[PDB]
Amino acid sequence: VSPPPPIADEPLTVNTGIYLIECYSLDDKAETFKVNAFLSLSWKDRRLAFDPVRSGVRVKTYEPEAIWIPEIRFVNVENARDADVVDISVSPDGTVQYLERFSARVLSPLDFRRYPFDSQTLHIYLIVRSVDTRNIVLAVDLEKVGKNDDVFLTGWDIESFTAVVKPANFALEDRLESKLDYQLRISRQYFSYIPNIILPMLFILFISWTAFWSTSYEANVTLVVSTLIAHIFFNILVETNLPKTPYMTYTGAIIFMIYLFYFVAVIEVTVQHYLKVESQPARAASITRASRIAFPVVFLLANIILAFLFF
Amino acid sequence: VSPPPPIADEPLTVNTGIYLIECYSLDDKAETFKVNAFLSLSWKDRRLAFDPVRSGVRVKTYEPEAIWIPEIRFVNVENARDADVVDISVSPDGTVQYLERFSARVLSPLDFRRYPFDSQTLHIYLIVRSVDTRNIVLAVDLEKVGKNDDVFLTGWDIESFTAVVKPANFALEDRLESKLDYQLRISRQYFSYIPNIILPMLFILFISWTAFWSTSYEANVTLVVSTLIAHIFFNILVETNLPKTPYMTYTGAIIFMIYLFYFVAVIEVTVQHYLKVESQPARAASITRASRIAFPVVFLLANIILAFLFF
Amino acid sequence: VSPPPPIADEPLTVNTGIYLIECYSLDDKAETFKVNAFLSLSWKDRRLAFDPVRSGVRVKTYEPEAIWIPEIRFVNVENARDADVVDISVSPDGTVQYLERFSARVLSPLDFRRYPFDSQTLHIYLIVRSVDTRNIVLAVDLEKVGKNDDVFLTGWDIESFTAVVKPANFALEDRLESKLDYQLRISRQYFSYIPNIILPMLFILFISWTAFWSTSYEANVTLVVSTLIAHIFFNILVETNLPKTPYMTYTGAIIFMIYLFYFVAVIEVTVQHYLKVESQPARAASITRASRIAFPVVFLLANIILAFLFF
Amino acid sequence: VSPPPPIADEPLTVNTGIYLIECYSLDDKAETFKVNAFLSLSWKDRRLAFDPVRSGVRVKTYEPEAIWIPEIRFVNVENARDADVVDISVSPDGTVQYLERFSARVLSPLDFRRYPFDSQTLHIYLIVRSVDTRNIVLAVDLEKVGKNDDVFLTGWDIESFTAVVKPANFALEDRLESKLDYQLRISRQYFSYIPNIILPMLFILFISWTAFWSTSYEANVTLVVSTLIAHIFFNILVETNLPKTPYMTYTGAIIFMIYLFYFVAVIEVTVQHYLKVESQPARAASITRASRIAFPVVFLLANIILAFLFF
Amino acid sequence: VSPPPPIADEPLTVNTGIYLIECYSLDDKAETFKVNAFLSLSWKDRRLAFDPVRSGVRVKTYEPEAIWIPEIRFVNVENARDADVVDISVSPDGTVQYLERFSARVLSPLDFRRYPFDSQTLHIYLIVRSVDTRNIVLAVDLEKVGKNDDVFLTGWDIESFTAVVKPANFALEDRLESKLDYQLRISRQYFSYIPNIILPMLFILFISWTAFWSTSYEANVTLVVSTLIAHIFFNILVETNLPKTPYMTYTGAIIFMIYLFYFVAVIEVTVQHYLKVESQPARAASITRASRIAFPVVFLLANIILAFLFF
């Protein structure tokens, strides 16, 4: 067993396909997802050709170890995939049809910039390294790229599974390597973030602004500091579900900005009280009266600016 | 070793049965559960037939590798199941009786809409792919579908384990595939949610309403904001036990609605105080007096509406 | 290799023994524990007889694959146990002595009703399924059931490891199955729950009752609501260490009841204040004075009632 | 392949050594640690000797399966160790030198009594069970017990790795078993506990005592209850890092005692207020004045008493 | 199969190369990271040479078991690496080119002193132990050390992957061992720590200082104690992401210092109130007036001092 030799001096073309059976565990923090799929491989091995009329049979079967099979590997996996050879068929002209069912944990970076209203392109990169007697090159048989209808990935919507047809061919340690890019396009179901995080977070913020209709320092200090604490909780909660990025994320920005609002609210609450103690309630009164409008307005303007920058 | 050929031109029928020995780890978040069971397979392989008389035994035993065994696989598993062949028996006319004990982690979506008063239908999908010389088709031998009496699944009640007798047959990459649907019907034991989450959550809400019998702004602000914080804790707790759904869940809705109650309570507490400072306690007095009735009543009406929509 | 045939028409008796070397990870939530032990099997196989004289050796040693070994399996495990055959001895008469060292994760329900003052009976169920040529039946060789002295199971006291000598024999999918029940009796070391949970929880409750010696509504509201929150924390803590049961647990009940005390305390604090504002401190005074006695007394009575119901 | 027979009637001595390459994951809760090391075995097998002069080779090599190797196993591991045979050398007189590299997860109880100022003795117990034709006995070749210089175990200081030279020999299920005790002496680096837990915990306690310089009930109640809550947080934090012991631990005791201080502080705060409302500020005044001294003094005395009892 | 013998009496040189394909899971707490890479080995084995001419081949291929392959192992791994031999080539003069793809979990200490503005040098140590017939020595073929462009390690920037060319040779249990040090230089992306932890932590501290512009003891006590609690939360959060070090870390120091500020603020708040009650507001007034400047100034000075000591 060793590679089938060139008729002329052409590279060996291995036709590939991936057909997703299952998708699970898209782990945002680790930036990985698990996949369970059929991997199909096809290539011409002439040493294996036979006659259809005299052979009586129109297709022949083989056990993995009996014939040469190209070593296809995934680039971005954690560990070598788990594979069960399902079937190997050889037709008269010596065309081999290989089919395996595999499962793997795939590494694939996510762009958290628009979280939780983001979309991602997961990748599964197939690769093959040329042997000494000949160069192996990959291709996509579109007929065999797909996914079953039930493939659901919790908390995500699956848009499409397609392969970039043209391999990237390059040299790696003095041998040719042929690599294919299968893409799984998904978008996050942001729905639940609304009632679980966003609204509660806004509610507590608005509750903080009631201090602008109160002349009680002690009350205000309680309103503002208490809610600020609840905000910290949401901040901590949100940040435990994301990995640490070197860029601001949309939610990250809103969350951060909101601290600025609490800080300024505290200042206002402080100033108002100070003026009152210093026997000048009228300045205090008009600073608070202004704040009742400024706060919601600037909060609204700042958010529009952010949504614009981010979307 | 290769498939037994047709007497006429019929498909090969593989009779299947699953018999649950253990059920554990129904993981709500991941939407998976673990199973440990017997898988039984039966089919006719004539090349194995024999005369009871000349051979002096009514049954014949084999080791897996010695005979053709159909490749049955589960659709919705994470990894290829863990299997020990328990026994392979062949009777005179060449009927094979295969028995394996396996364990697997099964993917199966849950409908969280009525959590925690929900019921689910877990599925185990058996599948087989036709080979080139013939089509394989699955069937359920009801005699061999079951579960032992001790099979308990923590925090769930097991209603039934049955198979949909008629396989779904379809083409997948130009070969016929025969798939069976075994169903495990369970319902969640909602009992503990009552004292651990529901009642405590109601208690803190009712405590908030005592603010309606208090003319102390500072006190009220403390009652309302404090309890609101405890509510956030229950909210966070509850949401860490569920996955993120693109639909409102029953508990989710109650939890969310309750925030609305805290927000409105804060407004009332604010308005009441404001009016009092502005030297009009009588309007304040009657807004509070109304609230004592409105709050509980609207809370009760809103809940009836929800239970109706959800159940 | 296939079962040894009957002298008369008796079943084949396999003598078993389990000798615990290690016990760890009793996981309350998952209801499992890990075990590491010797499994010993003995049975007559006459086909293996030999003459010490004509073979030089008093005992023969065999390698697993060389002889028939009965397929013993555990019922309540997650995955097929991890086994290393330690030794296989055959005495001339053909008695086989088999010794393996295994490790497994065992499923075994716990009764949380008296937590954390509970005791449990863990089970390890050995099983064997009869083959076609003969029935296999299990037995306990008490001489070989035990555990080493150092076997410690963190946070539990080990009472005893014994086997129920009489197998349960029954039919399962048309073959006889012989099952043995090994029992590991343990009791939880409740000690630490005292300083870590119980006492702190009582301290915070008693602290709340100081509100009964205070005429300050604002103070009281703080005492009662604050401690109520700390109670919620202990409640959450406790419930993260237990699985969800369809029955009230002892701690669960105490924890729940205590909420009732906080709720009633809030009412009292509310009533007292209300009356005071309404210019009737004398009724208030005597409601508070009553509460100072009622609360501790009813708390004590209710606890005695519970301990009685639970123990 | 079977044991080498006695020249006289002596037991077979297997010389052992463990050389630590890596130490990691000392998990306090689970009471385990992971080890990666060389295991060396040596024994005389005469059937394997040869001529030094005639052969021209000073030593000779074998593959594991070609010769008898004694079955050495670890007592206190979770699963059978992971082993790669590195090399097997046989010298002229038939002395075999075996060397493997293994990794294992070792169970070994810790004494938490002085946490976090504790020291531990981890154990790795080698064992061998005698065969029928002869008794195997273990010994330590000190020349081959050691650890490399870089072996660092996070958050612990490594004192020494030594073996108790004399095996413990005993009968277990009617065969002799020879067991060796390798000891790894470590001591916890308590440093970080100081700024992360101990000091913060003291700071919050001292902050509570400022209530003794305040005549404001409402303020005090806030100081004392707030800090008590922060104490609960540290308590919870600390207890999540330790397993549950049936004995008080040093930190456990300090933590517990401190609750007593909060409880008594609350009483004092209550009494002081009560007396003040009852128009007797002078008794109140002298109870508070006493408390300013009593609290710190009794806290200091109690701690000295504890350190004495524990150290 | 056994080592190729010396032409003269030279050691056998094994040329090595590591080419990173993937980097993930740098786990700060455990001090490990996962790697997926090509490992290339090359050495001269004369027994394998051939004449290019009477063979009609430039190179020859082999299966692992057919030829001698040096046992290269990693020092600092948890478990023996997962390896797939990709290809083995032998050129005419008997030079072997071996290529495997492996994945492993590597142990490698981190210096947390400047967290989160730290840089680290991860190591992968290749090793080989000499056999009896000859000494094996490692070397780096720089041509084959590298990493692919996409190698991203979440939350870290990858600076470089180089090997220290000169092996460290030493004796270990009476055999020579040759060890190589591959270094992966990374630096932490500190960006997110700014908005998620640092700033929030400063905001709450500054909010505490508003107490210096308030004459309300009750208010102040709330401001100072509340924020102190939020600080504890950030402290706990931060410390759950780091392992426990025997040295102060930069963040650790800032965090600790800040407690000192809260403690002193509480004292000031206490003193101010005390003086006020004692009818001397003017001393109080000037202590508070001083604090408004002292606090921020000393906080700023202390930070400059720390950054200096740490950076």
PDB file of N, CA and C in Angstrom, chain C residues 31-60:
ATOM      1  N   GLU C  31     -25.577  11.622  42.261  1.00  0.00           N
ATOM      2  CA  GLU C  31     -25.900  10.359  42.882  1.00  0.00           C
ATOM      3  C   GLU C  31     -25.030   9.208  42.445  1.00  0.00           C
ATOM      4  N   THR C  32     -23.731   9.454  42.386  1.00  0.00           N
ATOM      5  CA  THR C  32     -22.773   8.443  42.000  1.00  0.00           C
ATOM      6  C   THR C  32     -21.601   8.433  42.969  1.00  0.00           C
ATOM      7  N   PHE C  33     -20.764   7.401  42.879  1.00  0.00           N
ATOM      8  CA  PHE C  33     -19.529   7.315  43.662  1.00  0.00           C
ATOM      9  C   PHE C  33     -18.526   6.511  42.865  1.00  0.00           C
ATOM     10  N   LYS C  34     -17.247   6.661  43.155  1.00  0.00           N
ATOM     11  CA  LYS C  34     -16.251   5.948  42.382  1.00  0.00           C
ATOM     12  C   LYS C  34     -15.665   4.847  43.244  1.00  0.00           C
ATOM     13  N   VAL C  35     -15.378   3.706  42.636  1.00  0.00           N
ATOM     14  CA  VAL C  35     -14.849   2.607  43.408  1.00  0.00           C
ATOM     15  C   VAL C  35     -13.669   2.023  42.692  1.00  0.00           C
ATOM     16  N   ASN C  36     -12.719   1.511  43.466  1.00  0.00           N
ATOM     17  CA  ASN C  36     -11.552   0.831  42.929  1.00  0.00           C
ATOM     18  C   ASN C  36     -11.385  -0.426  43.778  1.00  0.00           C
ATOM     19  N   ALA C  37     -11.451  -1.599  43.139  1.00  0.00           N
ATOM     20  CA  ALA C  37     -11.519  -2.859  43.854  1.00  0.00           C
ATOM     21  C   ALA C  37     -11.034  -4.071  43.098  1.00  0.00           C
ATOM     22  N   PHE C  38     -10.859  -5.170  43.842  1.00  0.00           N
ATOM     23  CA  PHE C  38     -10.557  -6.471  43.262  1.00  0.00           C
ATOM     24  C   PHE C  38     -11.917  -7.091  43.008  1.00  0.00           C
ATOM     25  N   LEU C  39     -12.079  -7.725  41.853  1.00  0.00           N
ATOM     26  CA  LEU C  39     -13.273  -8.517  41.538  1.00  0.00           C
ATOM     27  C   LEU C  39     -12.722  -9.924  41.389  1.00  0.00           C
ATOM     28  N   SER C  40     -13.224 -10.873  42.167  1.00  0.00           N
ATOM     29  CA  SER C  40     -12.731 -12.227  42.032  1.00  0.00           C
ATOM     30  C   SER C  40     -13.826 -13.145  41.513  1.00  0.00           C
ATOM     31  N   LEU C  41     -13.470 -14.011  40.580  1.00  0.00           N
ATOM     32  CA  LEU C  41     -14.416 -14.937  40.002  1.00  0.00           C
ATOM     33  C   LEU C  41     -13.841 -16.346  40.063  1.00  0.00           C
ATOM     34  N   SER C  42     -14.692 -17.314  40.394  1.00  0.00           N
ATOM     35  CA  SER C  42     -14.296 -18.718  40.429  1.00  0.00           C
ATOM     36  C   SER C  42     -15.372 -19.651  39.905  1.00  0.00           C
ATOM     37  N   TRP C  43     -14.957 -20.635  39.121  1.00  0.00           N
ATOM     38  CA  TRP C  43     -15.901 -21.564  38.512  1.00  0.00           C
ATOM     39  C   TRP C  43     -15.171 -22.774  37.956  1.00  0.00           C
ATOM     40  N   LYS C  44     -15.872 -23.901  37.911  1.00  0.00           N
ATOM     41  CA  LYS C  44     -15.287 -25.144  37.430  1.00  0.00           C
ATOM     42  C   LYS C  44     -15.340 -25.219  35.925  1.00  0.00           C
ATOM     43  N   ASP C  45     -14.197 -25.490  35.323  1.00  0.00           N
ATOM     44  CA  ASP C  45     -14.153 -25.754  33.896  1.00  0.00           C
ATOM     45  C   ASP C  45     -13.323 -27.007  33.703  1.00  0.00           C
ATOM     46  N   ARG C  46     -14.023 -28.134  33.569  1.00  0.00           N
ATOM     47  CA  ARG C  46     -13.406 -29.450  33.523  1.00  0.00           C
ATOM     48  C   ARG C  46     -12.525 -29.681  32.325  1.00  0.00           C
ATOM     49  N   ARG C  47     -12.829 -28.989  31.235  1.00  0.00           N
ATOM     50  CA  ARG C  47     -12.001 -29.047  30.048  1.00  0.00           C
ATOM     51  C   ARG C  47     -10.595 -28.589  30.335  1.00  0.00           C
ATOM     52  N   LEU C  48     -10.371 -28.017  31.502  1.00  0.00           N
ATOM     53  CA  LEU C  48      -9.055 -27.475  31.778  1.00  0.00           C
ATOM     54  C   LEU C  48      -8.234 -28.306  32.719  1.00  0.00           C
ATOM     55  N   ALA C  49      -8.667 -29.531  32.984  1.00  0.00           N
ATOM     56  CA  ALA C  49      -7.953 -30.352  33.941  1.00  0.00           C
ATOM     57  C   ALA C  49      -6.600 -30.748  33.396  1.00  0.00           C
ATOM     58  N   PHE C  50      -5.681 -31.052  34.302  1.00  0.00           N
ATOM     59  CA  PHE C  50      -4.337 -31.438  33.911  1.00  0.00           C
ATOM     60  C   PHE C  50      -3.643 -32.244  35.015  1.00  0.00           C
ATOM     61  N   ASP C  51      -2.562 -32.926  34.650  1.00  0.00           N
ATOM     62  CA  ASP C  51      -1.781 -33.706  35.598  1.00  0.00           C
ATOM     63  C   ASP C  51      -0.504 -32.939  35.977  1.00  0.00           C
ATOM     64  N   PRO C  52      -0.347 -32.608  37.270  1.00  0.00           N
ATOM     65  CA  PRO C  52       0.852 -31.920  37.766  1.00  0.00           C
ATOM     66  C   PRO C  52       2.100 -32.671  37.305  1.00  0.00           C
ATOM     67  N   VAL C  53       2.075 -33.988  37.491  1.00  0.00           N
ATOM     68  CA  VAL C  53       3.121 -34.911  37.027  1.00  0.00           C
ATOM     69  C   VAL C  53       3.469 -34.754  35.538  1.00  0.00           C
ATOM     70  N   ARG C  54       2.448 -34.897  34.694  1.00  0.00           N
ATOM     71  CA  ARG C  54       2.609 -34.861  33.243  1.00  0.00           C
ATOM     72  C   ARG C  54       2.739 -33.442  32.692  1.00  0.00           C
ATOM     73  N   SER C  55       2.839 -32.428  33.555  1.00  0.00           N
ATOM     74  CA  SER C  55       2.951 -31.042  33.079  1.00  0.00           C
ATOM     75  C   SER C  55       3.898 -30.158  33.909  1.00  0.00           C
ATOM     76  N   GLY C  56       4.447 -30.746  34.969  1.00  0.00           N
ATOM     77  CA  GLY C  56       5.452 -30.132  35.824  1.00  0.00           C
ATOM     78  C   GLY C  56       4.997 -29.151  36.881  1.00  0.00           C
ATOM     79  N   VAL C  57       3.904 -28.455  36.582  1.00  0.00           N
ATOM     80  CA  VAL C  57       3.380 -27.364  37.402  1.00  0.00           C
ATOM     81  C   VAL C  57       2.145 -27.690  38.297  1.00  0.00           C
ATOM     82  N   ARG C  58       2.150 -27.261  39.572  1.00  0.00           N
ATOM     83  CA  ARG C  58       1.021 -27.524  40.498  1.00  0.00           C
ATOM     84  C   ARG C  58      -0.240 -26.746  40.119  1.00  0.00           C
ATOM     85  N   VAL C  59      -0.042 -25.547  39.584  1.00  0.00           N
ATOM     86  CA  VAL C  59      -1.133 -24.703  39.127  1.00  0.00           C
ATOM     87  C   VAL C  59      -0.748 -24.186  37.755  1.00  0.00           C
ATOM     88  N   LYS C  60      -1.726 -23.971  36.890  1.00  0.00           N
ATOM     89  CA  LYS C  60      -1.422 -23.389  35.597  1.00  0.00           C
ATOM     90  C   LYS C  60      -1.882 -21.956  35.607  1.00  0.00           C
TER      91      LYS C  60
END
